[PDB]
């Protein structure tokens, strides 16, 4: 198609950007990263080994056997872990992002054969994709932690004389924990992995279809 | 899905139909047509030539094989010549050795058992080309045709390729003039014949028509470009 | 779906599996080839001696006649068969006419046979491409090439095998009527392009040179390594 | 998806995968060895049938004469083994037919290399699942040590190891073999130092391995196989050796 | 909607559903990815153009041979697969030189392509020889000639057919190309037109500028033989376009 | 799977199931023959069904002479059985011709079971789905019994049968033979009708069934009359 | 299931389904009949006109395989030549060896051989034609014998092929052809034809006739015209 | 997958599978057992019958090769009887060339070679037999097995067949190099007698012994004899 120069330059902004964006990320950036999440898991706060520690006071009023509530805090050790997560998941996420888009650009013309290339491009696409829906499903389960206990605490405070509820919310703090060390642990291995397969097959996937041939044609 | 049995020759269908030699009989429909007709002293061939561009000359869609007998070729030009130069070492042959000309029953006899082959072994396709045959001998004028099936008939007239069942209706009307015509008017009854499968827009031209005569007095001829104007001139316009 | 077998095309009319024996001559170890003006220098790397084998019994640069050498990039086995071939045709040649090969009409042989392999399923192309230098009988130099798919073309200078792109980019850098106007620059020129790609310099390299009217010889090691000292001390 | 079937069929990025798979097989085979000294050369090979029910009939089940000037040991498929070891016999053979003089080790390898290459290329057959090595002297250029692939392609080496184990074998062999310093003595200690590496077997069992050398006495080769008493000396040798260099730390 | 099973194009000797054969039509295909080559048939003679794709500096221009020498009547330019386009080349020439052999004269130009075109033909494997490629041949060749009946100019492709053709482009530009040489083209025009008009047309579909290096030309006339225009012939005409 | 479907490929328990599936076939016939041996002589029974009455009953026979002195009863694929008939007759003469006197019974069952076995070793030809069964009176070892299978089994027997009620048929003779006093030729006869008449619960009459002999005192192979079949199935009913 | 893909294969059951499907080919054939008198053997067949543009007397299904015997076929017609070549040179090579004119039914039993060799070979497909065999001499007397695709043959008193078999057969079973002659037989062969044939589905036939027997001195030949017209109006007439 | 059907397919970690497979064909056949005494060798088998109406006289699992060689199976029986024709004519060929008997290696060794003749070419299936071949020559004895793959080994003593491996184990148990073969039988018919799953009588095994005399088939009242203990 006709191309003016500004929008042939436009593109190769583009381009020249999302490659060198791609290069420093996986040399640079995952490293550091690899080596942050490991000391973070290292850190005492993720390695608590009493849950009895991480479950915090519901301030019910126990009904006695024949007044009301006051402000029901949530867990500060639950939400400063997740304030340390949340930063790594969303990161982690647009990461992938530049690596699925670094490696479609890279994807060559449509053609019969030599596709082995492209084969090798389409299944660290698999696998790229397979961790963008874990990192999703970290994404949403964050939120569904504070609104389920949110909605444990206001049953808890409704039916005072049921504890299941105030046992369920103890329940949901220490899950949301278990949770949350996994899920530092897996940010850690995804980054590691998209290290190892992007590394050991960057050969293929920046050159898919390969030298030129001697052209019998 | 039924996309088995289509795969090679040597595959019965459930149904008893072997499905490659009909896709076979599908390249004949894919040519320019062509249409025979016979008279009692004459036997006709006439075709519709096409041209890959217009600077291109256009294709030889008949072909002499004898004095006596010559073909016309719908389907593929390759399984055409190299049934043509089967026939042609036939003819001769039979010169050689009985100083007779071969007759053309035998001769499409042959060219059966020949393309029959293919078809029962594994191996070669079936010759794709179908052939209308036209020679005279003793008997008398005759008019075959040939499928990439091996079978073949006897006809009073016919017609294959593109569209030739127009032509085939066209004949069908008009076969009873045809027995008693001259042969001016029997090959002007051909070109309207083929007339009729062209597309409306196109017409007949000296270019893309060629006529095949063979008769009593006359050995197989194919009326070239320049040589067609004479049969081409008596017919008066599209219906 | 089209490249299972040498005989189908593929939509667009591409033979994948002669493109495949192309690519498996990459894999092989680098030649390059130079002509000079009355020299004809063939250079080809050494991939490793593994301290308990014997050299000897290795080698890629080899003479089909007195008139013509050979330098192959590909699989060994279908190198030493098509060295075979191309020999006793040579000699079967001088049988016949009762005059020495040309080394253009050894390279049609070789890719004759080649192509003969590819037209055929149930025969595998060979894997190699060959780099063949001669000196014609006006005495011109000659260097051509082949590959797999049995298309020959001559060339003034050129490379085969592992790093023949970055070798040849060099070369057509480097290539000028100025270097090959010395046999001594010309060895020099081809020692420097495999330098380009090779580990180490005089460890790694096995060249050759063809003279005028001069039977091939391999360059000693301690040529090699002396003409590597002087391209290295100039640097 | 497969480009591994039918040896004829160059996969993407050139390679033959069938050879590979041969060259695969190999590797269970029982190790073969042969060291390169400079008065002689020898084969050293593990008898990897160890069945007690079974006869020591043959001269050797591992290493075969090819003739009077060379040997071999092979590894790999017995049937296809069997079929290399005749049309190398019938090859030198025939050069002695022809030329009245010894086949050259070299030119014998190489006919048969050729043949390992053409039952790669045709389409039909199948490679030969065997790597084997030749020992023989020949008048241009001495003693000589040989080894041979599926894929048709040999090499010569001082000293190497084919089979189980053949990686142990070489990583011992580049330290302790000695370049121009070799004698058969110690070529057989230094074998029976490998075989005791690479073999499970905690004692050589010296009925667990078939030893041959090649040697020229009064100008004509001689091809012996060490005898079991030859062979447990051998091993009682090394075993003291080995204990007195443990005894000493 | 898409429908792409094809599952009959693969194999030769299978014909598809409506009968098309098409490894022979993807064999038509492949003359595409050739270099374009181009001939113009005049009453003074015919021409016979090609571009040749150098791929390198280091490569020798002379030994790309995409316009040859059947025999000094005829010559032929060729574009799509190198090696089975020398095959059919030596078919030519062999062919040729028997009929000198056994007639004493020099073949027409319709009757060497019919000749190249029978071997072209074989692929279907009709024959028991195992001496004849079961894929059929990616090349097509156009033989220019002076023949009993003047310049003549044949093409052949894959099919192994064969007609005459006023001018016709093979390769890559075919397309298009064919188009100006159908506005260009008109049958008084004279071979110093023609050779101009040709390169034309090919510096137009050509990627690379037009240089004397980067193309072969050839006319055979009829009082000369077959004729390649030769560096210096080649630098005066594309100067004078 | 796709360990069947090719006779050359071994199953994973190396089982050849493609001549397995040929034994099937000798069953899908739907007719039972039956052999037992005598002290003085062989017979062999069989089903003869005739589908229609516009077939004539002297054409359609399964029992066929290899020789004067031999004969045979043929179970499975018609034209398979007519066709290693045929190889056998083949082999007989062909035996006679080399070495000078007539083909044993067991070595005729041999030559047509190693032949059945190169069938089942190469790959393009199938098996021939058919089985044998040889009647004939050697000199030296009385009379005879044998039969050949599509793998190439060829043992001999003292009473066997092939079909579809094989089993059963086997069943009753393995009881007849295990109180053992005799077989004179009309026991013989009167043994094989009653175990075909008995497995297919037939109860014959005597156009239904044929039957051939050999016997020490005429060696030659004779297919009974319908009269003498019915003179036999009399002396059945009535004791 | 891959079964049913070549004849080598056998399925499970023990059945060669390639020969069945190559026998369901003649039933799409139009149908043809061949009864047995005392005098001789009488063939009939319905031959569909396709198109008027075709000729009277082509796309015969009734060949002369030899002076004595005719031929009748029915399935593809482009096996049915190749098969009656086969017949005709068998006959051919027995006369040249054995000095005289075929058996019928050796003839039948080596055509039949030849048909079975293609239904065991991978390579090659059964045969698509059912054909039916006849002669007379005053040796043999009249044969009529029948051969499918699988290579089964067999004698039949009257016999039927193609689309119509079983109809034509009962019709033919209400005959009594034994004690009959060949020229009644034309017109009870003529009836059967004009009784199966379905003018919804085929347009229109043309009858193709032909008999051996004494009143030929045993040459298989075809049926002259006014026999021909007398048959076909007897036909037309019991039809009603 | 692709490398189960074909025969000329070297699968991953490079196995034959096909050839492995028709070694399980001969595992399935009956018990054979062969024991190499100082003065002999026997070679029995059981030669289990379904009927009665089996006639035991018309075939025989022992068949001498020659008058010194004799040999049993384990697997298919059709692909025993080819092979053992091809034995027959070897040892006659190679009486032709020589006019001496044949060593007992060197016959085991051509039919060996005919079995991987057999094993390369795609369209044939190999062999699923595998057999032991005895013989007497230069007044020693000799066992041997040649397995479907074209491979063959020499053995003391050994069994093929059903229940093989415990066989073995038997062997090896019982198994004394000084064994006289007037014990040697009795060792083999008691290691068949450890996988009959019958009681075994003079028809349903057949046996054969192999000494200076030759090999021979010693006969059911012979078999009877040695069965009474």
Not at chain 5, 34 to 42: D, M
Not at chain 6, 164 to 191: I, N, P, R, Y
Not at chain 8, 160 to 174: A, I, Q, S
Request: negative net charge; aromatic residues 8%.
């Amino acid at each position: 198609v006709r191309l003016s120069g500004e929008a042939r330059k436009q593109v190769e902004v583009f381009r020249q950007n999302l490659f060198q964006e791609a290069e420093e990320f996986l040399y640079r950036f995952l490293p550091q990263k690899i080596i942050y999440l490991n000391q973070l898991l290292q850190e005492d706060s993720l390695n608590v080994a009493d849950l009895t520690s991480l479950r915090a006071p519901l301030d019910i009023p126990i009904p006695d056997p024949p007044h009301k509530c006051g402000f029901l805090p949530g867990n500060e050790k639950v939400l400063s872990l997740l304030a340390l997560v949340k930063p790594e998941v969303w990161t982690l996420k647009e990461k992938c992002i530049l690596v699925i888009t670094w490696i479609q650009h890279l994807i060559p013309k449509i053609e019969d054969g030599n596709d082995f290339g492209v084969a090798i491009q389409e299944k660290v696409l698999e696998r790229v994709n397979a961790v963008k829906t874990k990192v999703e499903a970290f994404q949403t389960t964050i939120s569904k932690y504070f609104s389920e206990r949110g909605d444990a605490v206001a049953k808890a405070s409704k039916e005072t004389h049921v504890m299941d509820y105030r046992a369920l919310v103890h329940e949901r703090d220490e899950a949301a924990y278990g949770e949350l060390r996994a899920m530092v642990l897996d940010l850690r291995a995804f980054y590691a992995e998209l290290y190892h397969i992007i590394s050991s097959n960057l050969e293929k996937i920046v050159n898919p279809k390969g030298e030129e041939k001697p052209s019998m044609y | 899905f039924r996309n088995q049995y289509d795969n090679d020759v040597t595959v019965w269908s459930p149904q008893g139909r072997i499905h490659q030699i009909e896709y076979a009989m599908e390249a004949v429909k894919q040519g320019s047509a062509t249409v025979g007709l016979k008279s009692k002293t004459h036997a006709v061939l006439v075709a519709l030539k096409r041209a890959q561009s217009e600077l291109a000359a256009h294709q030889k869609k008949i072909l002499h094989v004898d004095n006596h007998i010559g073909i016309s070729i719908a389907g593929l030009t390759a399984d055409a010549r190299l049934l043509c130069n089967f026939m042609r070492q036939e003819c001769l042959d039979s010169r050689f050795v009985f100083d007779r000309p071969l007759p053309v029953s035998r001769l499409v006899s042959l060219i059966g058992s020949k393309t029959q082959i293919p078809t029962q072994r594994y191996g070669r396709r079936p010759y794709g080309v179908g052939l209308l045959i036209a020679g005279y001998d003793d008997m008398g004028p005759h008019i075959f045709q040939t499928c990439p099936s091996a079978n073949y008939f006897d006809c009073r007239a016919m017609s294959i390729g593109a569209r030739s069942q127009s032509a085939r209706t066209y004949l069908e009307r008009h076969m009873s003039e045809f027995m008693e015509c001259n042969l001016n008017e029997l090959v002007k009854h051909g070109l309207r014949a083929l007339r009729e499968t062209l597309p409306a827009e196109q017409d007949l031209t000296t270019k893309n028509v060629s006529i095949g005569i063979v008769g009593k007095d006359l050995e197989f001829t194919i009326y070239d470009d320049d040589d067609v104007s004479p049969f081409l001139e008596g017919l008066e316009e599209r219906p | 779906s089209y490249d299972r077998a040498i005989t189908v095309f593929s939509p667009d009319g591409h033979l994948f599996q002669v493109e495949y024996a192309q690519e498996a001559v990459k894999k092989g170890s680098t030649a390059v080839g130079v002509r000079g003006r009355d020299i004809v220098v063939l250079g080809v790397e050494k991939k490793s001696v593994a301290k308990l084998q014997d050299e000897r019994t290795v080698r890629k640069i080899c003479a089909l006649d007195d008139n013509v050498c050979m330098a192959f990039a590909g699989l060994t086995a279908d190198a030493r068969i098509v060295i075979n071939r191309a020999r006793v045709e040579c000699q079967s040649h001088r049988l016949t006419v009762e005059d020495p090969v040309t080394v253009e009409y050894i390279t049609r042989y070789i890719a004759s046979l080649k192509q003969r392999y590819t037209q055929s399923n149930g025969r595998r192309p060979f894997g190699i491409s060959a780099l063949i230098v001669g000196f014609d009988f006006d005495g011109t130099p000659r260097l051509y090439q082949t590959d797999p798919s049995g298309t020959y073309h001559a060339w003034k200078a050129n490379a085969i095998g592992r790093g023949a792109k970055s070798v040849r980019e060099f070369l057509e850098k480097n290539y000028t009527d100025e270097a090959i106007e010395t046999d001594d620059l010309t060895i020099k020129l081809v020692i420097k392009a495999l330098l380009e790609v090779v580990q180490s310099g005089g460890k790694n390299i096995e060249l050759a040179v063809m003279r005028r009217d001069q039977s091939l010889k391999i360059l000693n090691p301690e040529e090699i390594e002396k003409y590597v000292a002087e391209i290295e001390k100039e640097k | 998806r497969r480009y591994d079937s039918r040896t004829t069929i160059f996969s993407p990025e050139g390679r033959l995968y069938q050879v590979e798979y041969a060259m695969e097989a190999i590797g269970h085979a029982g190790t073969c060895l042969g060291i390169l000294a400079n008065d002689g050369v020898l084969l050293a090979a593990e008898r990897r049938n160890i069945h007690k029910l079974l006869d020591e009939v043959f001269f050797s089940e591992k290493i075969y004469k090819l003739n009077e000037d060379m040997a071999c040991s092979v590894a790999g498929i017995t049937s296809d083994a069997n079929v290399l070891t005749n049309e190398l016999r019938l090859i030198a053979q025939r050069y002695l037919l022809q030329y009245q003089e010894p086949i050259p080790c070299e030119q014998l390898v190489t006919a048969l290399c050729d043949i390992k290459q053409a039952y790669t290329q045709f389409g039909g057959k199948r490679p030969f699942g065997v790597s084997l090595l030749y020992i023989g002297w020949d008048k241009h250029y001495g003693f000589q040590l040989y080894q041979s692939d599926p894929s048709g392609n040999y090499g010569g080496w001082k000293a190497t190891c084919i089979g189980n184990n053949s990686a142990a074998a070489v990583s011992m062999l580049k330290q302790d073999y000695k370049e121009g310093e070799m004698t058969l003595k110690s070529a057989l200690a230094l074998a029976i130092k490998v075989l005791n590496k690479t073999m499970d077997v905690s004692k050589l069992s010296a009925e667990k391995v078939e030893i041959a050398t090649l040697t020229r006495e009064n100008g004509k080769t001689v091809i012996r196989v060490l005898k079991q008493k030859e062979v447990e000396q051998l091993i009682k040798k090394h075993e003291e050796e080995e204990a007195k260099a443990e005894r000493e730390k | 909607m898409f429908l792409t099973r094809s599952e009959y194009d693969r194999g030769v000797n299978t014909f598809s559903p409506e009968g098309r054969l098409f490894q022979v039509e993807y064999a038509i295909e492949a003359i595409k990815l050739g270099s374009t080559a181009i001939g113009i048939q005049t009453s003074e003679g015919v021409c016979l153009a090609v571009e040749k794709r150098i791929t390198s500096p280091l490569m020798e221009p002379s030994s790309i041979e995409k316009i040859v020498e059947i025999d000094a009547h005829i010559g032929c330019a060729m574009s799509g697969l190198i090696a089975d386009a020398k095959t059919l080349i030596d078919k030519a020439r062999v062919e040729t030189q028997n009929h000198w052999f056994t007639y004493n004269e020099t073949m027409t130009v319709e009757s060497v392509t019919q000749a190249v075109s029978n071997l072209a033909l074989q692929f279907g494997e009709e024959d028991a020889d195992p001496g004849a490629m079961s894929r059929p041949f990616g090349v097509a060749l156009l033989f220019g000639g002076v023949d009993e009946k003047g310049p003549q100019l044949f093409h052949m492709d894959p099919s192994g057919t064969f007609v005459q053709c006023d001018a016709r482009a093979i390769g890559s530009a075919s397309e298009g190309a064919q188009s100006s040489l159908q506005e260009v083209y008109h049958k008084s025009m004279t071979l110093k037109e023609a050779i101009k008009s040709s390169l034309i047309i090919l510096k137009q579909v050509m990627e690379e500028k037009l240089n004397a290096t980067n193309i072969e030309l050839a006319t055979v006339q009829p009082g000369q033989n077959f004729h390649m225009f030769t560096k210096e012939e080649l630098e005066e005409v594309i100067k004078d376009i | 799977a796709g360990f069947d479907r090719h006779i050359t490929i071994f199953s994973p328990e190396g089982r050849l199931y493609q001549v397995e599936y040929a034994f099937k076939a000798i069953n899908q016939g739907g007719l039972t023959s039956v052999a037992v041996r005598g002290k003085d002589c062989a017979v062999i029974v069989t089903q003869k069904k005739v589908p229609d009455k516009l077939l004539d009953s002297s054409t359609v026979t399964h029992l066929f002479k290899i020789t004067e002195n031999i004969g045979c009863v043929m179970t499975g694929m018609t034209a398979d059985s007519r066709s290693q008939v045929q190889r056998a007759r083949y082999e007989a003469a062909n035996w006679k011709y080399k070495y000078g006197y007539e083909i044993p019974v067991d070595m005729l069952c041999k030559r047509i079971a190693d032949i059945s076995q190169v069938y089942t070793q190469n790959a393009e030809m199938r098996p021939l789905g058919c089985c044998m069964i040889l009647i004939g009176i050697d000199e030296e070892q009385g009379p005879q019994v044998y039969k050949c299978d599509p793998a190439g089994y060829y043992c001999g027997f003292k009473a066997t049968a092939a079909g579809v009620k094989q089993t059963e048929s086997t069943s009753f003779l393995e009881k007849k033979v295990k109180k053992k006093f005799d077989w004179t030729f009309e026991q013989t006869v009167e043994t094989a009708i009653t175990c075909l008449s008995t497995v297919l619960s037939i109860d014959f009459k005597p156009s239904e069934i044929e039957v051939g002999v050999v016997t020490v005192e005429n060696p030659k192979f004779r297919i009974l009359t319908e009269a003498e079949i019915d003179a036999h199935l009399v002396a059945l009913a009535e004791r | 299931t891959g079964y049913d893909l070549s004849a080598s294969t056998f399925s499970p059951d023990g059945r060669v389904f390639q020969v069945e499907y190559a026998m369901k080919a003649v039933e799409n054939s139009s149908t043809a009949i061949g009864i047995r008198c005392k005098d001789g053997v009488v063939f009939g067949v319905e031959k569909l006109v396709l198109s008027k543009l075709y000729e009277e007397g082509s796309n015969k299904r009734l060949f002369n395989v030899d002076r004595h015997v005719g031929m009748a076929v029915a399935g593809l017609l482009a096996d049915a030549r190749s098969l009656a070549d086969i017949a005709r040179e068998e006959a051919s090579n027995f006369r040249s060896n054995f000095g005289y004119n075929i058996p019928l039914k050796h003839l039948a039993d080596r055509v039949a051989m030849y048909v079975h060799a293609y239904t065991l070979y991978s390579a090659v497909r059964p045969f698509g034609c059912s054909f039916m065999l006849g002669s007379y001499s005053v040796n043999d007397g009249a044969q009529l014998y029948m051969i499918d695709p699988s290579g089964v043959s067999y004698g039949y008193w009257g016999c039927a092929i193609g689309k119509a078999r079983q109809a034509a057969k009962t019709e033919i079973e209400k005959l009594q052809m034994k004690e009959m002659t060949c020229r009644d037989i034309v017109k009870e062969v003529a009836k059967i034809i004009y009784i199966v044939h379905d003018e919804v589905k085929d347009k229109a036939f043309e009858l193709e006739l032909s008999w051996v027997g004494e009143l030929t001195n045993g040459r298989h030949e075809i049926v002259p015209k006014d026999i021909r017209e007398e048959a076909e109006k007897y036909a037309k007439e019991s039809l009603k | 997958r692709g490398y189960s059907f074909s025969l000329t397919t070297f699968s991953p970690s490079g196995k034959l599978v096909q050839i492995e497979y028709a070694l399980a064909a001969v595992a399935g056949g009956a018990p054979s057992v062969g024991i190499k005494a100082a003065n002999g060798v026997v070679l029995a088998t059981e030669k289990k019958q379904k009927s009665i109406l089996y006639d035991e006289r018309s075939v025989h699992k022992v068949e001498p090769i020659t008058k010194h060689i004799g040999l049993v199976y384990s697997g298919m029986g059709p692909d025993y009887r080819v092979l053992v024709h091809r034995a027959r004519k070897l040892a006659q060929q190679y009486y032709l060339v020589y006019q001496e008997p044949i060593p007992t290696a060197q016959l085991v060794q051509r039919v060996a070679s005919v079995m991987q003749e057999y094993t390369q070419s795609g369209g044939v299936r190999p062999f699923g037999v595998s057999l032991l071949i005895c013989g007497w020559n230069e007044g020693r004895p000799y066992l041997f097995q040649s397995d479907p793959s074209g491979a063959y080994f020499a053995w003391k003593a050994t069994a093929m067949g059903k229940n093989y491996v415990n066989g073995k184990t038997f062997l090896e148990k019982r198994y004394n190099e000084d064994l006289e073969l007037e014990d040697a039988i009795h060792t083999a018919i008691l290691t068949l007698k450890e996988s009959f799953e019958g009681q075994m009588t003079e028809d349903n095994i057949e046996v054969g012994i192999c000494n200076e005399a030759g090999f021979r088939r010693l006969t059911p009242t012979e078999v009877k004899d040695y069965l009474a203990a």
